[PDB]
Design a protein around this ligand. Structure first.
Ligand SMILES: CCCC[C@@H](CN[C@@H](CCCC)C(=O)N[C@@H](CCC(N)=O)C(=O)N[C@@H](CCCNC(N)=[NH2+])C(N)=O)NC(=O)[C@@H](NC(=O)[C@@H](NC(C)=O)[C@@H](C)O)[C@@H](C)CC
Lengths: 99, 99
C-alpha cells in the first residue's frame, strides 16, 4: 500500500498466532511490542528512546505478518508506550519512504 | 526521492539559518530538534517516547527545509539525543510510506 502520514501509520500485525496493532516506525531500528509471551528463549537487552532506556526481552527469528506481508526477524518485548515495527522488519517487507 | 530503510533515514535540514542532520521518524507526531536558540516566543511542553518524557520548548511557524523541500510548522527544542522530523512536517513535504 501507499500510506500517508496525516494520521499515525497504524496497521494490524499477526505474531505468535494473535492480532495486534502497531505503528510503522522509520525512526526505530528494532521492532518493539508490549509485554506478551512468545514461544522460545529470549535474552535481556536495553534499548533507548528520546526519554531514556528500558529493559526488553529479545526474541530472534519470529514470524510476523504485517498488513499481509511476511517477515521473520527479531522482536523485542517490553514496556514500550506503543507497539512499533522498526527497520529490521520494514526492510523485509520492502518498505520505503518517498517524497 | 526514495529512501530505503537499511540504515537510519538521516537527511539534511535547514532551520533557523542552520544546516543539521535529522532522522525521518514516521513514529513521531512532532518534530524535535537538539538544543538550538531560535526566536522570540515559546511555550513549555513535555513529550514522551520509550524511556519516559523530556521537557521541550515549543516554537511555532518555524521554516524547516528538509532535503530541499520547504516546510513551516511547529518545532520542539530540547535535549533530544537525535534531531527528529515527525509527521507534522513529513506531511508538508508529501512523504509517504510504500510497500
Ligand atoms: C514508542 C513511542 C513511539 C515511537 C517513537 C520513536 N522515536 C524514535 C526516535 C529516535 C531515537 C531517539 C525511537 O525512539 N527510536 C528507538 C526505538 C527503539 C528501538 N530499539 O528501535 C530507537 O531506534 N532506538 C535505538 C537507539 C536510538 C537509535 N536511533 C537513532 N540514533 N536515530 C536503539 N537501538 O535503542 N516516537 C517518539 O518517541 C515520539 N513520541 C510520539 O510521537 C508520541 N509519544 C508517545 C509516548 O507515544 C506523541 C504522543 O508525543 C517523540 C519523538 C515525540 C514526538
Amino acid at each position: 500500500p501507499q500510506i500517508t502520514l496525516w494520521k499515525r501509520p497504524l496497521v494490524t500485525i499477526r505474531i505468535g498466532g494473535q492480532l495486534k496493532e502497531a505503528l510503522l516506525d522509520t525512526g526505530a531500528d528494532d521492532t518493539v511490542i508490549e509485554e506478551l509471551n512468545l514461544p522460545g528463549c529470549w535474552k535481556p537487552k536495553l534499548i533507548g528512546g528520546x526519554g531514556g532506556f528500558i529493559k526488553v526481552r529479545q526474541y530472534d527469528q519470529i514470524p510476523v505478518e504485517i498488513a499481509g506481508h511476511k517477515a521473520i526477524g527479531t522482536v523485542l518485548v517490553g514496556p514500550t508506550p506503543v507497539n512499533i515495527i522498526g527497520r529490521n522488519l520494514l526492510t523485509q517487507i520492502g518498505a520505503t519512504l518517498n517524497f
